[PDB]
């Protein structure tokens, strides 16, 4: 039983992990939505250039 | 530069529109951020249970 | 309830960036607005 629980505990922690995991993906897209944006603004002065 | 004054007229319309635009828009955020504070309260709630 | 304040964070992290974005582009417009003085 108590191997059993400790088992839980664990996954339970890890299914935590993932969650913050997603949330990085959010923001790991939302500065990269515009962060390359950005350099195709740069892009924008290069044709400036 | 009639033309030019009513288009710089127009653009500080424009830009009025955005301000309020953005007024509104971090007034939601404020309340979503009450909203969030009102959750974290609850869940020390939770957490005292 | 956890699960649900994260929801509420994350949709709380889009809008601020969403309204970032909207007074970015409310300050450009401002900013264009320098040739009024002519």
Redesign the interface.
């Known amino acids: 039983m108590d191997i059993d629980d400790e088992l839980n505990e664990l996954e339970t922690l890890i299914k935590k992990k993932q ?1 913050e995991k997603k ?1 990085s993906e ?2 790991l897209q ?1 500065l990269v939505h ?1 962060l390359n944006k950005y350099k195709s603004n740069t892009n924008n002065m290069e044709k400036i250039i | 530069s009639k033309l030019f004054q009513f288009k710089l007229l127009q653009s500080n319309s424009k830009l009025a529109s955005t301000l309020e635009k953005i007024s509104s828009s971090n007034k939601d955020l404020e309340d979503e951020k009450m909203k969030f504070q009102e959750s974290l309260k609850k869940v020390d709630e939770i957490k005292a249970q | 309830e956890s699960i649900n304040e994260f929801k509420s964070i994350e949709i709380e992290m889009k809008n601020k960036l969403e309204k970032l974005n909207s007074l970015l582009t409310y300050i450009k417009s401002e900013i264009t607005q320098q040739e009024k003085g002519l």
């Open positions: 969650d949330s959010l923001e939302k515009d």
